[PDB]
Amino acid sequence: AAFGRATHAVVRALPESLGQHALRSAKGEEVDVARAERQHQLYVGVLGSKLGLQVVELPADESLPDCVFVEDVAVVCEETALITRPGAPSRRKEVDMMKEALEKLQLNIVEMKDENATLDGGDVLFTGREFFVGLSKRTNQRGAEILADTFKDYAVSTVPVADGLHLKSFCSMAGPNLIAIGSSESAQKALKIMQQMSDHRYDKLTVPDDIAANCIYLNIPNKGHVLLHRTPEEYPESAKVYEKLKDHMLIPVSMSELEKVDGLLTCCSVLINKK
Template sequence: MGARRRRPHGNMPGGEPMGRGRAAGGAFSAASAGGGRASLACPSAVPAARAPRPSPPSPACSMAGLGGGLAAFGRCTHAVVRALPESLCRQALRSAAGPEVDFARAEREHQLYVGVLRSKLGLQVLELPADESLPDCVFVEDVAVVCEETALITRPGAPSRRKEVEAMKRVLESLNLNIVEMVDENATLDGGDVLFTGREFFVGLSRRTNQRGAEILADTFKDYAVSTVPVHDSLHLKSFCSMAGPNLIAIGSSEAAQKALKTMQQMSDHRYDKLTVPDDAAANCIYLNIPSKGHVLLHRAPEEYPESAKVFEKLKDHMLIPIANTELEKVDGSLTCCSVLINKASEL
């Protein structure tokens, strides 16, 4: 079961679940699983009764599954991406053995992805150079979580990826964001485990992200409730879910995905809509709210996941942009992995 951190109060480590049970029906227009809420442990927190949840502001947030509270949800002005190193083909981390990445094809697919962000959607794209000593560096999502004017520089769960944060920190500083660095050696956090809905955060507890990492995220973004979600059989939480629109969560059909969904239902006070797709990998998509174009959704190409593409086609109020990700998927890459999306208020 997941755990819940509420603002402004919390429990000390080892505290009992706090708060009253949910009303029947739960969130996501589905029945909620039973159980209470446990707060995230925090050294500075003291035991307290549940307090009314503060109303969230209207943020501009991103972690390559962009949030932006309510009316501003999905607004974006900038994208940070990174070129592919050739070392990715043989040295990138992967959860299972498989065919080698075709570098030329991977580069073409990535260039098309970046081209959509820059040319089709009009974002200001900041592209970091590849670093051959960092074979996973194209997956920029994992090294930063951006919400409003604050950027949390993470401590990735894989030690081989920790130097990736240096270039990301520099580029986010150039945007005059407030930088918070995760320096606790007991903490790990990958951005791929962080789902921001515009109202709250869900943080996957996975092979790459631990409880202490979730606590530091909660301390960084104090205006939002944070719930932890156990992740089994997948690399990250967003390996099988993402935001597909305001109030809309795309979710895969696997047992692991559906179990995580039930946990999120249980943890949340809000009723979200859900969009269930047959393929877990296809549930990772990128929603943007572009003033000149309206609702935009980047999703996996029909030739990759035809049945899931049919589900996305039902979103008649979205501008649908299919994106191929055949090669980076071989090393556990998803669409959200390859960008950090940022909304600079001064640019609106």
């Protein structure tokens, strides 16, 4: 029942069309689909085998080049699952296969059907005490209002996110009351806003690389604090900061290929606690 406790994870295999057709905020180097497929299999392995979570592996769909990023299509809090309306219209078909799996796990399903509301799960930070929803090109006020209406036990606040980013492109929960946050002025300005509207001031773990602030914190039975972070090969300066967590079981998980299409650690799984 502790924060970050999960029993199940929903993931989705990446399709071959990802390398060429997955949306990306910036032109860059060519995506190695084989290596990305390799890194995704290592990611699922950490959640499923190394950590014992019950993994629902959804099949790829070549017509949905971004279907690997299941986090955008669902926000899960306790037994309630919010099926979002992704801001990219072409991604909204990834919702059908996620809803089918979330109700087989017997969660209370709420679908964001409002044709004026968009929300990417990647814009939602759940601190265990409240929600923060980034207002980006993908997530609008209506979508944030619908999330607030879906989890009325928890406070919801919004924070402006700039450019083609998500909120969790520069932050994530690194532990109980611990927010990993980037060192840029953009990230610190957003954190300054979030700490303002909260009735609680969090501890922060500042990393020199915004993207490396995206980590997966987990509380596993008979293991305790577990954190998946980017490798020292990718972001050595931020990996050094994570090594300070002496009571965390640290796991380096690479994501260098999917990062080319703005894919981070939190985007590739929906974590669920089923008692």
